[PDB]
Structure 1
Amino acid sequence: SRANDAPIVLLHGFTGWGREEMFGFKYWGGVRGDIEQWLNDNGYRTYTLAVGPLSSNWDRACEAYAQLVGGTVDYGAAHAAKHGHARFGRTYPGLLPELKRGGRIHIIAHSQGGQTARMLVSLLENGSQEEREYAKAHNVSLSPLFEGGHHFVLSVTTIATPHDGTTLVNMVDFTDRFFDLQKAVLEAAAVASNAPYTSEIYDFKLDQWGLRREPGESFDHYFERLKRSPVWTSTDTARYDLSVPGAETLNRWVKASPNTYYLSFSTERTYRGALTGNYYPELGMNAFSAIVCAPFLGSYRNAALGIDSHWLENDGIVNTISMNGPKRGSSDRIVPYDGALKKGVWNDMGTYNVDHLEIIGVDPNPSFDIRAFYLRLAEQLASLRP
């Protein structure tokens, strides 16, 4: 039975868009339907966040915060000075004013969304010593996000998240293939990358970098510009955080809060080869991953990064070993789900035979009951003792 009434908040990874974007084709549900709607229809109040898909987890966390409580995104004076982009971003009305009145939320996060959710909790609870000290040094104002003390988040659930990074970023032509992946997802949503679209469709929300697709500019042409831009070449990027070294850097400061439940779901869609330790894409994996990404993930090793035979099982995008929780440079703990969910520790909820895009319904999989998956999850989150 239900032990809390906290609303659920959905949070995408390095692709993702708002419910009004992509002509209403939902990131959360894809070709299968509308997950937020399934949850709301079953009495589990649910919202969707949309943040910069290519931006750093820091930027995304500041965006999520302003998107949740309202106001103008503030990336911090220290951060903005360090990386050379605007301090202030777009303005939001505020999804959940109940939060500033003492409410809480469950965050369900897919892929890189799981890093963002963790970082948001870390900032909400502890703030940033670097931002606090900078503000005191320069006597500039400070966003409450950097002060600490917020109890907004009852739980965080990560699904197929690269807590320890993905070796996908180490591919020789990663840059071109990463943006081909963006185009494959567009295509899955019946949007072409070579059309000179004049209206919005997919906002990458790069306000801070002053970057935006021009009207009549195709996503092909736009992505070529993004490739050469600071959101691809700087350390303040999704690209860096997604890497094994970048993920560990994140892990060294983004820790589990003892006041928060953490759930993780892992994914695999591979088989192990015969005379090799390599892993290979299963029948049914989304075609782009099976052809472009999975062979590399299931065979790439790297001694300096500690990428060995345990890293080869994957879901087409992320190595499965990375998903149960942060471990590289992390003080967080992970325990197998044993029927009772515990605060302040990663509860490994199991591994599912579902690839990176199938789990959100963006690629079909008739044998996967995606409705039941998310309904069972919502039920578990509602049972959490406040």
Structure 2
Amino acid sequence: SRANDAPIVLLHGFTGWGREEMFGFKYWGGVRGDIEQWLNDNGYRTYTLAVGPLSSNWDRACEAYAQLVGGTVDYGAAHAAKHGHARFGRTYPGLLPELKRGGRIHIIAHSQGGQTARMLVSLLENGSQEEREYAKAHNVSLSPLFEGGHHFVLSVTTIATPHDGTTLVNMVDFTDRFFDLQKAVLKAAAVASNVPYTSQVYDFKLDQWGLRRQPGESFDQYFERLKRSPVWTSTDTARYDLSVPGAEKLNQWVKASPNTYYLSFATERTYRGALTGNYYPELGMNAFSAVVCAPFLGSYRNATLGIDDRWLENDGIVNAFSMNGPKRGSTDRIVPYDGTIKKGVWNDMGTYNVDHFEVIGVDPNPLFDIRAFYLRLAEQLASLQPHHHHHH
């Protein structure tokens, strides 16, 4: 039964856009519909975050905070100076001013969005010691996000998240395939990549870096410039955070709050080969992933980097082994779901036979009851108790 009234907030990964972008083709629902609308219609108040898809988890968290409470994005003086980007970004009206009033939220995140959510919670709770100290030594102002003490998040749900990174980033032609992936997503929403569209369409939100598609520039050309930009070349990027070392690093500081519930969902759309031990993509997997990404993910081994046979099963984009929760360089606890949702630990809700894009409806899958998946999820989050009790 309903035990809390917190609103649900949806969060995307290395790909994603606002509800008004892509001519309305939703990241959350894709060809299958509108996930946010489905939840709202069924009585679970739901909102959508849109943040920089290629940006670091840190930038994304700063953007999320501001998008939630309202205001101008504050990346932190120490952080901005450390990476040579702007300190202030876009201004948001704020989706949930109630947060400043004691309200809470459930975050449902997909792909890299899971890392962002974890980071958000950490910053909210603990702030940033480095930002606090930089503020004091330089006499610069400080965003509340870096103070700590905030309690807005009742839970975090991650779906197909690379908590321990994805081996996809080790592909020699990663840079080109990655951007071709973006092109495939554009293709899914019936948008061409060789057309200099005058409407926005897909805003990558690179205010901090001063980058944006110009008049007369198609996505193809825009991506060519991005590839040579700091959002692809720096350590303050999705590219880095998505990597096995980059993830481990993030895990070294981004910890599970003992005040928040965490749910994890894994995905797989592969089959094992008997003679090679490798994993192959199943019939139905989004075409781009099956041809370009899956073969690699299910065959790439690296002993020195710790990548072995447990890393081969994948969802076409991320290794399944990486989803149940942070493990590399982490102190977080992961617990297999036993009918009871524990606090401050990762509740491994299992593995689902869906690919990276089918799970959000971007790639069709008629055997996947997407509406029921999310409704079941919403009902489960709504049943979370704001404070459980110790019993026999």
Name the TM tier (shorter chain): over 0.9
Partner of 1:298: 298
The one-character-per-residue Cα deviations of 1:351-386 (angstroms, maximum 9, x if unpaired) are 000000000000000000000000000000000001
CA–CA distance in 2 between the matches of 1:18 and 1:294?
Answer: 28
CA–CA distance in 2 between the matches of 1:26 and 1:308?
Answer: 36
CA–CA distance in 2 between the matches of 1:309 and 1:342?
Answer: 30
- Could you tell me how far 1:276 is from its partner in structure 2? 1.1
What secondary structure, in the 3-state scheme, does the structure 2 residue paired with 1:73 have? strand
**Does residue 241 of structure 2 align to residue 244 of structure 1?**
no
- Is the contact between residue 267 and residue 315 of structure 1 (CA under 8 Å) also seen in structure 2? yes
What secondary structure, in the 3-state scheme, does the structure 2 residue paired with 1:10 have? strand
CA–CA distance in 2 between the matches of 1:49 and 1:6?
Answer: 16
Partner of 1:82: 82
The one-character-per-residue Cα deviations of 1:218-266 (angstroms, maximum 9, x if unpaired) are 0000000000000000000000000000000000000000000000000
CA–CA distance in 1 between the matches of 2:341 and 2:147?
Answer: 29
- Could you tell me how far 1:198 is from its partner in structure 2? 1.0
CA–CA distance in 2 between the matches of 1:308 and 1:65?
Answer: 37
- Is the contact between residue 11 and residue 110 of structure 1 (CA under 8 Å) also seen in structure 2? yes
Aligned length: 386
What secondary structure, in the 3-state scheme, does the structure 1 residue paired with 2:16 have? coil
The one-character-per-residue Cα deviations of 1:4-29 (angstroms, maximum 9, x if unpaired) are 00000000000000000000000000
- Could you tell me how far 1:74 is from its partner in structure 2? 0.2
What secondary structure, in the 3-state scheme, does the structure 2 residue paired with 1:231 have? helix
- Is the contact between residue 54 and residue 238 of structure 1 (CA under 8 Å) also seen in structure 2? yes
CA–CA distance in 2 between the matches of 1:3 and 1:51?
Answer: 30
CA–CA distance in 2 between the matches of 1:285 and 1:23?
Answer: 25
CA–CA distance in 1 between the matches of 2:338 and 2:353?
Answer: 20
- Is the contact between residue 167 and residue 318 of structure 1 (CA under 8 Å) also seen in structure 2? yes
What secondary structure, in the 3-state scheme, does the structure 1 residue paired with 2:32 have? coil
What secondary structure, in the 3-state scheme, does the structure 2 residue paired with 1:207 have? coil
- Is the contact between residue 199 and residue 215 of structure 1 (CA under 8 Å) also seen in structure 2? no
CA–CA distance in 2 between the matches of 1:199 and 1:284?
Answer: 33
What secondary structure, in the 3-state scheme, does the structure 2 residue paired with 1:31 have? helix
Q: Structure 1 regions of 5+ residues with no counterpart?
A: none
Compute the TM-score of the two structures, normalised by the length of structure 1. Answer: 1.00
CA–CA distance in 1 between the matches of 2:92 and 2:183?
Answer: 28
CA–CA distance in 2 between the matches of 1:142 and 1:51?
Answer: 21
- Is the contact between residue 22 and residue 201 of structure 1 (CA under 8 Å) also seen in structure 2? yes
CA–CA distance in 1 between the matches of 2:231 and 2:323?
Answer: 24
CA–CA distance in 2 between the matches of 1:303 and 1:123?
Answer: 34
CA–CA distance in 2 between the matches of 1:215 and 1:123?
Answer: 37
CA–CA distance in 2 between the matches of 1:141 and 1:230?
Answer: 26
- Could you tell me how far 1:304 is from its partner in structure 2? 1.5
Partner of 2:168: 168
CA–CA distance in 1 between the matches of 2:246 and 2:196?
Answer: 35
What secondary structure, in the 3-state scheme, does the structure 2 residue paired with 1:118 have? helix
After superposing on structure 2, the runs of 4+ consecutive aligned residues of structure 1 that deviate more than 4 Å are none
The one-character-per-residue Cα deviations of 1:318-354 (angstroms, maximum 9, x if unpaired) are 0000000000000000001111101100000110000
Q: Structure 2 regions of 5+ residues with no counterpart?
A: 387-392
The one-character-per-residue Cα deviations of 1:270-301 (angstroms, maximum 9, x if unpaired) are 00002111000000000000000000000000
The one-character-per-residue Cα deviations of 1:294-320 (angstroms, maximum 9, x if unpaired) are 000000001121000000000000000
- Is the contact between residue 55 and residue 238 of structure 1 (CA under 8 Å) also seen in structure 2? yes
- Is the contact between residue 27 and residue 362 of structure 1 (CA under 8 Å) also seen in structure 2? yes
What secondary structure, in the 3-state scheme, does the structure 1 residue paired with 2:169 have? helix
CA–CA distance in 1 between the matches of 2:304 and 2:222?
Answer: 35
- Is the contact between residue 297 and residue 314 of structure 1 (CA under 8 Å) also seen in structure 2? yes
- Could you tell me how far 1:199 is from its partner in structure 2? 1.2
The one-character-per-residue Cα deviations of 1:123-162 (angstroms, maximum 9, x if unpaired) are 0000000000000100110000000000000000000000
CA–CA distance in 2 between the matches of 1:206 and 1:70?
Answer: 19
Q: Percent identity, aligned pairs only?
A: 94
CA–CA distance in 2 between the matches of 1:196 and 1:245?
Answer: 36
**Counterparts of residues 62-211 of structure 1 (less than 5 Å):** 62-211=62-211
Q: Which has the larger displacement, 25-34 or 208-217?
A: 208-217
What secondary structure, in the 3-state scheme, does the structure 1 residue paired with 2:181 have? helix
What secondary structure, in the 3-state scheme, does the structure 1 residue paired with 2:36 have? helix
CA–CA distance in 1 between the matches of 2:21 and 2:130?
Answer: 35
Compute the TM-score of the two structures, normalised by the length of structure 2. Answer: 0.98
CA–CA distance in 2 between the matches of 1:216 and 1:93?
Answer: 30
- Could you tell me how far 1:267 is from its partner in structure 2? 0.2
Partner of 1:219: 219
CA–CA distance in 1 between the matches of 2:94 and 2:352?
Answer: 35
CA–CA distance in 2 between the matches of 1:237 and 1:190?
Answer: 27
What secondary structure, in the 3-state scheme, does the structure 2 residue paired with 1:208 have? coil
- Could you tell me how far 1:196 is from its partner in structure 2? 1.2
CA–CA distance in 2 between the matches of 1:188 and 1:134?
Answer: 44
- Is the contact between residue 258 and residue 343 of structure 1 (CA under 8 Å) also seen in structure 2? yes
Partner of 1:34: 34
CA–CA distance in 2 between the matches of 1:257 and 1:140?
Answer: 28
- Is the contact between residue 30 and residue 360 of structure 1 (CA under 8 Å) also seen in structure 2? yes
- Could you tell me how far 1:215 is from its partner in structure 2? 2.1
- Could you tell me how far 1:216 is from its partner in structure 2? 2.3
CA–CA distance in 1 between the matches of 2:98 and 2:333?
Answer: 31
CA–CA distance in 1 between the matches of 2:158 and 2:277?
Answer: 28
